[PDB]
């Protein structure tokens, strides 16, 4: 128990195997929730907000 190459092996496994699935999964949901539409502005203004992605 005196060498840390096992940590590097685990890091390589993490960036190799699960990283592809994480990239294929994380990119969709954030864009789906970019416009949830739950909060109506409830204001008598014609500013016509679209998304926080515009910000």
């Amino acid at each position: 128990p005196r060498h840390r190459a096992v940590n590097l092996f685990l890091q390589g496994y993490e960036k190799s195997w699960i990283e592809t699935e994480e990239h294929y999964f994380e990119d969709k949901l954030i864009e789906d929730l970019a416009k949830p539409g739950a909060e109506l502005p409830e204001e008598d203004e014609a500013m016509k907000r679209v998304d926080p992605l515009h910000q």
Binding site: I18, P36, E39, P52
Partner: protein, 74 residues
């Protein structure tokens, strides 16, 4: 006489890819499971890390962040 007389020294000349690299090559030789009795435990722990644990904290942070960014322009 050596340990094994299979071809030269060992099975498939274990000395060649054993003495060439121990700190790096030996660890990289474990390309996947079906090698020893610890591959199942390693796969179980790798799956055990990735539950997106926090999950309540992460979802509450995301919800409150969307709520902050959605109510008005900041």
């Amino acid at each position: 006489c050596p340990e094994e007389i299979r071809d030269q020294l060992l099975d498939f000349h274990e000395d060649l890819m054993t003495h060439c690299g121990i700190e790096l090559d030996e660890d990289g030789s474990l390309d996947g499971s079906n090698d020893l009795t610890i591959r199942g435990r390693l796969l179980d722990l790798v799956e055990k890390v990735t539950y997106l644990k926090k999950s309540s904290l992460q979802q509450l942070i995301s919800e409150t962040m969307v709520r902050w960014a959605q109510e008005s322009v900041i």
